Design a protein around this ligand. Structure first.
Ligand SMILES: CCCCCCCCO[C@@H]1O[C@H](CO)[C@@H](O)[C@H](O)[C@H]1O
Ligand SMILES: CCCCCCCCO[C@@H]1O[C@H](CO)[C@@H](O)[C@H](O)[C@H]1O
Ligand SMILES: CCCCCCCCO[C@@H]1O[C@H](CO)[C@@H](O)[C@H](O)[C@H]1O
Ligand SMILES: CC[C@H](C)[C@H](N)C(=O)O
Ligand code: NA
Ligand code: NA
Length: 441
């Protein structure tokens, strides 16, 4: 009845495209930065091995045995039991995260437009930092480019799994990796490599007595791995009988973390050479990356190449953010695919408009005490729904699955990995999440 990926690799690449997006470059930079660098990074790394690798496979496992959307996946496997709250919790993180995902993806298309028209080639008068300030504070200009991005996202989603989502131009994600390695090597010769690589790889332990860093790591880890958004459950619901689930979840985190690391090697050695502070808020990369391209001879070509490849990366990730409601509403309300995309994509766009305004006119306005609207949506989405959603997901398989079924559907045997993966779901990952919950609130 449902559409499916046309090969076992098509599922891997789509999941690779879903995972590797803006949370690798943009979000990883200013979150690693404002939380102490190397202390945070080693904690974010450790969370991906013991909380990440199991839950991605947990999501992949639950995705195909039910062959349903993220919510209906819990209704066809354990009907009547209250586990569907996790499938419900993740779709809410999809509506919330795609609202400001289109906000930051609007910044991508504006900068790309400026490099195409030859505007951001040299250092503007306002400066590479000031240019970003008067742009995110302008009430309407970010909303235009967000709507333009939400078109392609909506368009691709409305096209279909086999005619749109899976048809991602196969050679573009590798082009974004090769460039980042070439961009990482460049900033290493800007005079900030010592202050950068030390702050980014050598730990300052006193930070780990602040509990926010833990929650910050768990928030970033679940966010960069497409966890707790209902996106890995649905991408698993298009996987065929013949497929190895364990190999994909590893291939995705290894690529996402490798992409995540090179971004640190590129951003932070440049932040310390530019004399800039690593805790520069969400628009950290948009102050540094143009400042780095400004010192290259062909920097305008790099900028166009960088933002075309990073834009397509944010496009391949936000398209999957829309499938979670779309694949749900087609079942729950018999909506067609094209009707679901327009309706659910234009609402997600309007939901993010108060976030784009939180950078300028709505700066002093707060919802959650102490945070502006962008930071507040980010909190409930990425620091609550994502870490708490995976806990129920992890406890769901670990406790509410017959161990013979949990390993058979996850294509794991009774090997040490099969036990370890099961072990992390039953106890390790959920308690680490539960402990970080007790220690932050
Ligand atoms: C490419 C991998 C980089 C690994 C960086 C590990 C930590 C580097 O931090 C190092 O701390 C030392 C303290 O005096 C200094 O002498 C070094 O110059 C400094 O780079
Ligand atoms: C290239 C990938 C490996 C990078 C390993 C990073 C090494 C961690 O950094 C270490 O931090 C310690 C202070 O806490 C210092 O005493 C060590 O000299 C330093 O190597
Ligand atoms: C002092 C440095 C003056 C400019 C020397 C050019 C060296 C950088 O070279 C540039 O690096 C980019 C990747 O980083 C590539 O994409 C460009 O094609 C390449 O021209
Ligand atoms: C919302 C997260 C998106 C889908 C992607 N996982 C990223 O790291 O940017
Ligand atoms: Na992507
Ligand atoms: Na990611």
């Amino acid at each position: 009845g449902r559409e499916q990926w046309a090969s076992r690799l098509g599922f891997i690449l789509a999941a690779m495209g879903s995972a590797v997006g803006l949370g690798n470059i943009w979000r990883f930079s200013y979150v690693t930065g404002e939380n102490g660098g190397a202390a945070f990074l080693l904690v974010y790394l450790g969370f991906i091995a013991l909380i990440g690798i199991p839950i991605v496979l947990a999501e992949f496992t639950i995705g195909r045995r039910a062959q349903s959307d993220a919510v209906g996946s819990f209704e066809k496997l354990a009907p009547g039991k209250p586990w569907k709250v996790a499938g419900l919790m993740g779709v809410a993180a999809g509506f919330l995260i795609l609202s400001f995902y289109g906000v930051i993806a609007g910044w991508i298309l504006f900068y790309l437009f400026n490099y195409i028209t030859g505007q951001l080639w040299s250092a503007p008068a306002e400066g590479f930092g000031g240019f970003f300030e008067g742009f995110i504070a302008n009430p309407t200009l970010p909303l235009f480019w967000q709507a333009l991005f939400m078109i392609a996202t909506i368009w691709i989603v409305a096209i279909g799994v086999k005619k749109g989502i899976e048809r991602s131009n196969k050679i573009l994600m590798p082009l974004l990796g090769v460039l980042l390695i070439a961009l990482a090597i460049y900033s290493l010769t800007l005079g900030g490599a010592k202050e950068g690589l030390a702050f980014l790889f050598s730990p300052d332990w006193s930070a780990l007595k602040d509990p926010g860093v833990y929650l910050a790591a768990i928030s970033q880890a679940f966010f960069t791995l497409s966890l707790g958004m209902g996106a890995l459950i649905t991408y698993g619901s298009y996987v065929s009988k013949d497929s190895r689930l364990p190999g994909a979840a590893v291939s995705v985190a290894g690529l996402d973390t490798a992409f995540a690391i090179i971004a640190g090697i590129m951003i932070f050695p440049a932040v310390f050479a530019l004399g800039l502070s690593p805790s520069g808020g969400p628009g950290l990369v948009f102050v540094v990356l143009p400042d780095i391209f400004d010192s290259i001879r062909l920097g305008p070509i790099v900028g166009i190449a960088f933002f075309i490849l990073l834009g397509a990366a944010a496009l391949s990730s936000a398209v999957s953010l829309l499938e979670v409601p779309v694949a749900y509403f087609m079942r729950k309300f018999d909506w067609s695919r094209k009707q679901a995309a327009i309706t659910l994509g234009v609402i997600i766009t309007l939901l993010g408009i108060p976030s784009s305004l939180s950078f300028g006119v709505l700066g002093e306005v707060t919802i959650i005490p102490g945070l502006n609207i962008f930071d507040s949506v980010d909190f409930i989405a990425s620091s609550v729904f994502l870490p708490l959603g995976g806990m129920i997901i992890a406890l769901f398989i670990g406790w509410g699955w017959k161990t013979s079924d949990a390993l058979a559907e996850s294509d794991l045997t009774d090997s040490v990995w099969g036990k370890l993966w099961i072990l992390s779901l039953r106890f390790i990952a959920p308690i680490a999440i539960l402990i970080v919950f007790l220690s932050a609130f």
